[PDB]
Amino acid sequence: VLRRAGRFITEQRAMGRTVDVYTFGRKGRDFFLRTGFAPAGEATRLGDAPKLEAILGVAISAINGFQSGKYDELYIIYSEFINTLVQRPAIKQLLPVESPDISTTTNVDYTYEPGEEEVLNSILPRYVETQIYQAVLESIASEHS
Amino acid sequence: EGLNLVATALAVGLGAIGPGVGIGIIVSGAVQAIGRNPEIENRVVTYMFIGIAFTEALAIFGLVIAFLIGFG
Amino acid sequence: EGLNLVATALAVGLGAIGPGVGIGIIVSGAVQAIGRNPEIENRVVTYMFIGIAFTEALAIFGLVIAFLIGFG
Amino acid sequence: EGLNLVATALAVGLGAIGPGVGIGIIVSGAVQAIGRNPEIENRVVTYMFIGIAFTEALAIFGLVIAFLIGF
Amino acid sequence: EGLNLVATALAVGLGAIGPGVGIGIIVSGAVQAIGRNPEIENRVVTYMFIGIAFTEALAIFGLVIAFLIGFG
Amino acid sequence: EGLNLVATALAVGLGAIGPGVGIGIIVSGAVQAIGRNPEIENRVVTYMFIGIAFTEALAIFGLVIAFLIGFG
Amino acid sequence: EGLNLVATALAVGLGAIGPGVGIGIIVSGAVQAIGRNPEIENRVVTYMFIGIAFTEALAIFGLVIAFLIGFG
Amino acid sequence: EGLNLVATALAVGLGAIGPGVGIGIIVSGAVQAIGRNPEIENRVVTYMFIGIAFTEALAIFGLVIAFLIGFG
Amino acid sequence: EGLNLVATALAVGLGAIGPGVGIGIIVSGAVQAIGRNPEIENRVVTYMFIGIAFTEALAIFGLVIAFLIGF
Amino acid sequence: EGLNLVATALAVGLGAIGPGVGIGIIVSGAVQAIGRNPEIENRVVTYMFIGIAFTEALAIFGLVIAFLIGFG
Amino acid sequence: EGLNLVATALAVGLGAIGPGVGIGIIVSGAVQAIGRNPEIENRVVTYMFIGIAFTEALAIFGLVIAFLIGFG
Amino acid sequence: HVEVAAEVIFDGIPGFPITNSFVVAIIIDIFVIALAVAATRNLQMVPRGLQNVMEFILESLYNLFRNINAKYVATAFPLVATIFLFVLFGNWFGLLPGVGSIGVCGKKLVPLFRAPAADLNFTFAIAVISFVFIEYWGFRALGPGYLKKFFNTNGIMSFVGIIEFISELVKPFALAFRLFGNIFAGEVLLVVMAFLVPLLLPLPFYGFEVFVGFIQALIFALLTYAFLNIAVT
Amino acid sequence: HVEVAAEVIFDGIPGFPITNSFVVAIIIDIFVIALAVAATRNLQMVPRGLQNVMEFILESLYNLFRNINAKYVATAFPLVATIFLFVLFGNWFGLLPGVGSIGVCGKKLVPLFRAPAADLNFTFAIAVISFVFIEYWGFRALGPGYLKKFFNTNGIMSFVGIIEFISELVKPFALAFRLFGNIFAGEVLLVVMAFLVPLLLPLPFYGFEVFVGFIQALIFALLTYAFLNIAVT
Amino acid sequence: PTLFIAQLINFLLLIFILRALLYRPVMNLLNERTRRIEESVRDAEKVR
Amino acid sequence: GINPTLFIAQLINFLLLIFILRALLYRPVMNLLNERTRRIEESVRDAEKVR
Amino acid sequence: PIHLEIVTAERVILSDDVDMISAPTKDGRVGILPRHAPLMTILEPGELDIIKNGERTPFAVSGGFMEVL
């Protein structure tokens, strides 16, 4: 993952985009401190079965940067669990996406009570936290394997 | 004299200004409800029609009086 | 002097437009609840008709006077 | 001249303009609230009939005065 | 003394104040439903016009009696 | 002449239209606020009834004129 | 005694109140639909004018009487 | 001749249908605004009574004119 | 007599009742639509103006009678 | 005759119907607006009193004409 | 006989009830939109003021007739 | 156009004979019978042609009635459903070419050239049957019935009950006036179109007369069923 | 006994008689001038006293006009700020007793009268000053201008273009009528309420009348800037 | 005339009722207004 | 009671009213507002120069 | 008789069938019945109630969403 994250920064800096890093776990936190990219926000000492409240300390900061314009894009690097024997690193895009493929998109017109914009402005922060939480839990399973 | 001429005209003209709005509110209320919940259009229209044609009962009362005032 | 002709027309005419909007508002309000919660139909509809009956009351007083004045 | 006959009609015909709409707005108002919140029927109904009684009081007042005009 | 003249004008004028507002509510309500979703649009188009047809039913009653009150 | 009698009607008919709609709009708004926020049911009712009194005060203003004019 | 002169003005005055609000509501309803769903714009704007045509039909009916009363 | 007799009814009557409906909307708007969020309760109340102050001033303006007709 | 003066006032008076309400509703709907979706603003205004004029088309018709009645 | 006393009563009654309802819509719109967005209360209220003064302007125009009737 | 005094009140009284609520809906419609989106305030307020002037122009027309009939 | 009297005399020589409305209803019955012998006689298992037309009406009417109330198989609505075609038949012939100008050969009357309920005779008769069924549904089919009306309002509020009884009684009268008023106005609208100075211009009322009649025919039927359903429970 | 009139002269100047509107139009101006120099007399960086309150008033209005338009507040400020200050104190001056009692020199004509804005000549004069300030900057900013009144139909109907031109001349009339009427209403309310039970009854109306007088003062300046902003654009 | 005393008794009561209702809030607003500016210039002098 | 002779008199008078107040109060208050805003921005740069 | 599923980011709480739900939506408390119209709301800190054959189970909810098919 550090090779994947380390090489991923190369293209981003090659295209001219400044890069910032947020680390989960002490292994990632220490590697970037030695290299020089001091992490903006880190979350260590996560148990084998963490709750989503634990990752809010980092997920909130990452999203608040996107809203303020500090970060124009957000990514996550996690160890995908392909099999109990192979755990390839994986890269995922966090920026909210249009209808993921198609999921009941048809014959749907929810009467959004607080407002269509109000629901969207409140469900996106929760959706990205779920993606981060899903990646963290998947990485924990891949770590033990 | 034209007082019975104007009484016939006043009964229908003035008496059909509330039901005219009342019918409008029912259709807008029913149609918007169907758009939100299309699966129940069979139920609201059963009540949309016994609402409009029931509101028409008040306006037709003007015609009944007006016709009596006109000829009768 | 057909002034008493106008008295009948005014009673049926004016009395029919207050409830006329009022009846239409009830049905529109009732239909929206049906569209929102279809399974509570038997409760609002029961309350829909009793409210309409009150408007019908205030309406038929105008009509009955249009007949008492119409027939002396 | 028969102008007494108009005076009876105006008291009732104009007397039903206001509360005729008044009944409608509360019945729609309470039913919409009931449809949204079915459990709140306990206190919605009580205040719904207070409004009808208050509005119809004006309507009865039209009939009351009309009876004095009539007789 | 020309009192029949104002009777023809009064019926037309008061016959349009009511249904004129009602159609405005009907079209606005149904257009709003169409803007919510265009799939059910074909259903409410028929529902627009049946409401307008009933609203124009009161509208022409003033016009019907206007011909009756002036030329009759 | 009988304009002594018409003013009694106009003092009761007119001047009750405002409160007639005024009561209904206040009472409906309070009821709908109960459904949204039942916790503040008591707080808003204190403002329900004072609003009733304010618009009712005009009804008695019409009533006192009707009662004064009948008694001279 | 030019009472027919009043009928000419009264027909325009009362006949334009209904459409005067009817077109008002239709345009307001259509515009609000455009803002939420501008993709269905072309469909509703046609129906916005269809409703305007029905409402303005009564307004023209007043002008038909207005010219009829003034000129024979 | 009771023209001044009936003029009193018109002033208090027609002057009580404007502000009568007007303050009905004032309380309904505020009672629903309190329902959404009671944290602005103190600030809403001030403007709710300011609106009553302007509207009921008009009702008093009608009221004083009615008293003037009675005396001069 | 002076009965034409009543017709002078009735045309402008009753004529302005309808459009007076109608103009208010049109702009209010447009302003809400602009507020919710500012990028359709240039288009809805054209729809507002092509309809808001239809409302005063009757009001001008009242004013046309309001001067025809005078002379 | 006593038409001058009636005319001044019509100038205050009529003309206080629109502004009476007009102010009610003004405050209710602003009161609900600040409830949803308390941060712009000091900014949107300035528009409240512009609208209130506009509506009150037409109501007062009835009063000055009303006094121009009793005093010429 | 004092009939021209009545026409003066009707010119202003009737000419104010229409636009009296029209500008009432203008500001209320605007202030609601300001609360939803304060950013787009700077140009809708321009549409608020043109609409008010585009509405109050009809109201002043009634006041112009009041003075036109008041002094020939 | 031609002077018309709400009366029912027309050119009936016999005495209490067929009038314009009284003879049009009989002719409308033959038109329904003629259609029945052509569009409701030749049929098979597969619904096509004659069978398809009758099936659409019967299936739609049963579904609408069942959705409202189907507790009583026999109802005035099925009779009104048959009366729906009678109203449409009279309305359809009302706008026929030269049908409204009948009696063109002291202008003669227009017998058998009117609507089925152009007079109060047909409208009052239909409402009486509908009112009887509504009373039968509550007072005879629903046990005691007539809770709000009659005298079974002991458990109801003191302020309520008088309005409910009066409103229930006036329901049959309103339905009678709705059918009579719409039909009488439709005939006057057609006559007004002829009296109009415009030439070769169809009136909007005439163009929508069938739509007005078709909607009114089902409106009376649905209201009768709904009022019966309201009284039932 | 009330005897309230639209206008009054009370002369005051020989050769050419002058309306007594100038009598209070000067005392308010003297009050405005005398109070203004008091604020200008003290130039402390820490405001306190009558200089502080006038500092607060000017910036509060300055903030209001900047919100409407931040590029024209300075140019139009002298007109509107004088408008707000001059008519406010005149309307508040009507609260002071002596409006309908002074005049003895019987000679019941009041020299003090009521307020500067209670006379049509003053309000029309102020409005035309307000009016002429609008299109002058509308023309100066937009050169030849008339893009909107052009009725070029570019984005608007052909009929549109005439109407707002009609209301262009309405505002100078509307501005005068609105201020005169709402103070003439305050005129009689100060008077007719004293006629009917003056014990504690006119007390609530004074608070309303001083409130509306301040509001009419505030809007009238506000409208001129608001009309300037739309005219410029 | 008697009108002068009629307005005088109510006017003094009017100023009295605003004195007991408005005098405190306006001074509180003004005092904070002059307190904010005085510390703002004092803070600048401290920076100078 | 609208006399064009005295109407211009109030037209002339009020025009004089805005000019005298402009040269007496508005410019001094505007100048005080500008310098206060300038001085608070000067303190911002002074605080910036301190660090 | 509607398939109610109180799903939390940690674990699924309920998946049974329920008569009525006293949902505390942000705009206002709303009840839900087996054939409720399509809906999508936002919850606020409060108490959420479930009616199961007359039995009320007050699950306190500090926030969340709701999709009512």
Curated annotation (Swiss-Prot), chain A:
The keyword Cell membrane is annotated on this UniProt entry: yes
Biological processes per GO annotation: proton motive force-driven ATP synthesis; proton motive force-driven plasma membrane ATP synthesis
Bilayer topology annotation: Peripheral membrane protein
Keyword Amino-acid biosynthesis set for record: no
Location(s), subcellular: Cell membrane
GO cellular component: plasma membrane; proton-transporting ATP synthase complex
GO molecular function: ATP binding; proton-transporting ATP synthase activity, rotational mechanism
Keywords: ATP synthesis, Cell membrane, CF(1), Hydrogen ion transport, Ion transport, Membrane, Transport
Main location: membrane
Subunit (UniProt): F-type ATPases have 2 components, CF(1) - the catalytic core - and CF(0) - the membrane proton channel. CF(1) has five subunits: alpha(3), beta(3), gamma(1), delta(1), epsilon(1). CF(0) has three main subunits: a, b and c.
Role according to the record: Produces ATP from ADP in the presence of a proton gradient across the membrane. The gamma chain is believed to be important in regulating ATPase activity and the flow of protons through the CF(0) complex.
Family per record: Belongs to the ATPase gamma chain family.
Protein's UniProt name: ATP synthase gamma chain
GN (gene name): atpG
Location of this fragment in the whole protein: 98 to 242 of 290
From Swiss-Prot, chains B, C, E, F, G, H, J, K:
PROSITE patterns: ATPASE_C
Pfam family, any one: ATP-synt_C
Parts of the chain that traverse the membrane: 6-26, 49-69
InterPro entries cross-referenced by the UniProt entry: ATP_synth_csu_bac/chlpt, ATP_synth_F0_csu, ATP_synth_F0_csu_DDCD_BS, ATP_synth_F0_csu_sf, ATPase_proteolipid_c-like_dom, F/V-ATP_Csub_sf
GO terms of biological process kind: proton motive force-driven ATP synthesis
Subcellular location: Cell membrane
Chief location bin: membrane
Entry GO CC: plasma membrane; proton-transporting ATP synthase complex; proton-transporting two-sector ATPase complex, proton-transporting domain
Membrane topology, as annotated: Multi-pass membrane protein
Site (Reversibly protonated during proton transport): 56
Domain of life from the UniProt record: Bacteria
Molecular function as annotated in GO: lipid binding; proton-transporting ATP synthase activity, rotational mechanism
Keywords: ATP synthesis, Cell membrane, CF(0), Hydrogen ion transport, Ion transport, Lipid-binding, Membrane, Transmembrane, Transmembrane helix, Transport
Purpose of the protein: F(1)F(0) ATP synthase produces ATP from ADP in the presence of a proton or sodium gradient. F-type ATPases consist of two structural domains, F(1) containing the extramembraneous catalytic core and F(0) containing the membrane proton channel, linked together by a central stalk and a peripheral stalk. During catalysis, ATP synthesis in the catalytic domain of F(1) is coupled via a rotary mechanism of the central stalk subunits to proton translocation.
Family the UniProt entry places it in: Belongs to the ATPase C chain family.
NCBIfam families: ATP_synt_c (TIGR01260)
This protein's name: ATP synthase subunit c
Species this chain originates from: Chloroflexus aurantiacus (strain ATCC 29366 / DSM 635 / J-10-fl)
Gene: atpE
UniProtKB/Swiss-Prot annotation, chain O:
Transmembrane segments: 1-20
Subcellular location: Cell membrane
UniProt function note: F(1)F(0) ATP synthase produces ATP from ADP in the presence of a proton or sodium gradient. F-type ATPases consist of two structural domains, F(1) containing the extramembraneous catalytic core and F(0) containing the membrane proton channel, linked together by a central stalk and a peripheral stalk. During catalysis, ATP synthesis in the catalytic domain of F(1) is coupled via a rotary mechanism of the central stalk subunits to proton translocation.
Family (UniProt): Belongs to the ATPase B chain family.
Assembly mode: F-type ATPases have 2 components, F(1) - the catalytic core - and F(0) - the membrane proton channel. F(1) has five subunits: alpha(3), beta(3), gamma(1), delta(1), epsilon(1). F(0) has four main subunits: a(1), b(2) and c(10-14). The alpha and beta chains form an alternating ring which encloses part of the gamma chain. F(1) is attached to F(0) by a central stalk formed by the gamma and epsilon chains, while a peripheral stalk is formed by the delta and b chains.
Descriptive protein name: ATP synthase subunit b
Organism for this UniProt entry: Chloroflexus aurantiacus (strain ATCC 29366 / DSM 635 / J-10-fl)
Gene of this entry: atpF
Span within the parent record: 5 to 55 of 164
Swiss-Prot record, chain P:
Cell compartments where the protein resides: Cell membrane
Superkingdom classification of source: Bacteria
Functional description taken from the UniProt entry: Produces ATP from ADP in the presence of a proton gradient across the membrane.
Family: Belongs to the ATPase epsilon chain family.
Subunit structure: F-type ATPases have 2 components, CF(1) - the catalytic core - and CF(0) - the membrane proton channel. CF(1) has five subunits: alpha(3), beta(3), gamma(1), delta(1), epsilon(1). CF(0) has three main subunits: a, b and c.
Protein name: ATP synthase epsilon chain
Organism the protein comes from: Chloroflexus aurantiacus (strain ATCC 29366 / DSM 635 / J-10-fl)
